[PDB]
Design a binder for this molecule. Structure first.
Ligand SMILES: OC[C@H]1O[C@H](O[C@@H]2[C@@H](O)[C@H](O[C@@H]3[C@@H](O)[C@H](O[C@@H]4[C@@H](O)[C@@H](O)O[C@H](CO)[C@H]4O)O[C@H](CO)[C@H]3O)O[C@H](CO)[C@H]2O)[C@H](O)[C@@H](O)[C@@H]1O
Length: 362
């Protein structure tokens, strides 16, 4: 893999605003945090602070509407941000870059229309994704040009898919409507993911309690079988609830990890009581099972297909809605949407190019 590969950025947004691009991350060779310019040259961040201090302006001019621009991506792991009209405000902590946190009303970027893609380019190739784990906002498609010349892309919404997602969220009772951040003139900016919905109080900690209690009941009397390694189908852990705790035993008979009854933040964020540091792979499987609400219906996890996902009346509706509106049915609606390979990521071992397309607000 060469030192850099070209990233073609195409503006199909139909919007008149100028685009600012940021390529922010960590340089492979040095492990330093910083930014890369259009040439692919790396610029380490200056020293940050506690409290965090302002980052220098790392923007690259993005493509005008109907045109594309190319930047070189070095071996680097990070994000390509793009913002419409306004420049983003980044700050630097002791340990480096602070990521935006627009669930906070006071975040400097709360009112800015922006999104990002996540990528890693290294000696083993390119991984590049479309993600909705934090929010659903300005739409985009990512792609790779593979060694053999073939292309792969993902992240593209169906026609009407952008407004379709908001309209579906607004009509979902229980607090999902309060995920939507709407401008003064009624223009939608973004919808927060449900993890941040729990944080902001849009959704209660208890929103999944009834389903979770049904799962814990079911697996008090019968086994939950988790086979968490896709390439090792014979490796199984057996889960059973006793004393209110879901305990997993390995083939040797040892209890290897245990789960307390999870809450909404744990499920939606794939963290806390569902932390995924042998526990990690098991937790990952359970996380996807709770978000897709398949644990009750299918005691042999993970699911072998998507047919039974999101059928419960209370489920991760944000993830359900986004998947339903994606052209290829794939999305990153929650952190472990990669379970069963349903995530909007593409990769190649010998890339030579990538793409980011700013999509229309349709
Ligand atoms: O509860 C949250 C849980 O997940 C968190 O965030 C995930 C985050 O890991 C993520 O990162 C993507 C990577 O999965 C992907 O990694 C590639 C691997 O698949 C591997 O095989 O090789 C290559 C090269 O080493 C890796 O790059 O790389 C992509 C780059 O496109 C990453 O974006 O994306 C999802 C969705 O945004 C996040 O939700 C968090 O990291 C964990 O701490 C948490 O436990």
């Amino acid at each position: 893999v060469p030192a850099t590969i070209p990233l073609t950025i195409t503006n199909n947004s139909g919007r008149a605003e100028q685009i600012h691009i940021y390529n922010l991350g960590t340089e492979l060779s040095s492990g330093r945090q910083g930014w890369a310019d259009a040439s692919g040259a790396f610029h380490p961040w200056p020293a940050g602070g506690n409290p965090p201090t302002p980052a220098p302006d790392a923007s690259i001019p993005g493509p005008a509407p109907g045109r594309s621009t190319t930047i070189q991506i070095p071996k680097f792991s990070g994000r390509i941000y793009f913002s419409y009209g306004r420049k983003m405000e980044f700050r630097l902590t002791t340990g480096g870059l602070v990521q935006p946190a627009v669930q906070n009303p006071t975040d400097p970027n709360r009112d800015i229309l922006f999104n990002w893609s996540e990528y890693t380019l290294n000696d083993s190739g390119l991984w590049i994704n479309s993600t909705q784990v934090d929010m659903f906002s300005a739409p985009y498609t990512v792609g790779v040009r593979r060694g053999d010349g073939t292309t792969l892309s993902t992240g593209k919404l169906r026609p009407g898919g952008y407004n379709g997602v908001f309209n579906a969220l607004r009509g979902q009772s229980g607090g999902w409507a309060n995920l939507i951040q709407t401008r003064s003139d009624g223009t939608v900016l973004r919808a927060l993911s449900p993890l941040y919905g729990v944080e902001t109080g849009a959704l209660p900690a208890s929103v999944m309690d009834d389903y979770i209690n049904r799962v814990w009941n079911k697996y008090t009397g019968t086994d939950l079988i988790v086979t968490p390694f896709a390439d090792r189908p014979d490796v199984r852990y057996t889960g059973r609830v006793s004393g209110g705790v879901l305990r997993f035993t390995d083939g040797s008979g040892a209890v290897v990890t245990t789960f307390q009854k999870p809450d909404a933040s744990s499920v939606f964020g794939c963290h806390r009581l569902l932390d995924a540091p042998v526990r990690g792979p098991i937790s990952r499987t359970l996380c996807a099972g709770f978000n897709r609400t398949t644990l009750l219906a299918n005691p042999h996890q993970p699911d072998r297909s998507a047919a039974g996902f999101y059928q419960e009346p209370v489920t991760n509706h944000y993830a359900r809605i986004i998947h339903a509106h994606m052209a290829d049915g794939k999305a990153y609606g929650f952190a472990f949407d990669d379970v069963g390979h349903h995530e909007s990521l593409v990769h190649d071992g010998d890339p030579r190019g990538a793409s980011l397309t700013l999509d229309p607000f349709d």
